From Swiss-Prot:
Whole-protein residues included: 259 to 300 of 309
Role, per record: DNA-dependent RNA polymerase catalyzes the transcription of DNA into RNA using the four ribonucleoside triphosphates as substrates.
Superkingdom: Bacteria
Family, as annotated: Belongs to the RNA polymerase alpha chain family.
Record remark: domains: The N-terminal domain is essential for RNAP assembly and basal transcription, whereas the C-terminal domain is involved in interaction with transcriptional regulators and with upstream promoter elements.
Protein name: DNA-directed RNA polymerase subunit alpha
Coiled coil: none
Subunit structure: In cyanobacteria the RNAP catalytic core is composed of 2 alpha, 1 beta, 1 beta', 1 gamma and 1 omega subunit. When a sigma factor is associated with the core the holoenzyme is formed, which can initiate transcription.
DNA sequence: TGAAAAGGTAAAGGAGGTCTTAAGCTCGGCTCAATTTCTCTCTTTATCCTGTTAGATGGTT
């Protein structure tokens, strides 16, 4: 994510799950991890 | 001599590309009626040429 210039939660919220899967070497398990972390912050 | 401080090695796990099948389609070939060109004949017109024996003899607007 930091390689993708994503620096804020707003920036990450600007990406869809598909855009997250397009991130180079980002896999489904890592997208799930991000979803779980966001749920951890509601 | 002890101790940073960097540099290796062996994993675990994931990420990513590359392979395999059940479902379905549509695509070309093959046959095979079904016809539009083509090329001859075979005509049939389309176009040009010549002649015509009562007598006639200077314009309209």
């Amino acid at each position: 994510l930091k390689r993708a210039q994503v620096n804020s939660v707003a920036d990450l919220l600007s990406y869809t799950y598909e855009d997250l899967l397009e991130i180079k070497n980002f896999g489904q398990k890592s997208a799930e991890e991000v979803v779980e972390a966001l749920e951890r912050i509601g």
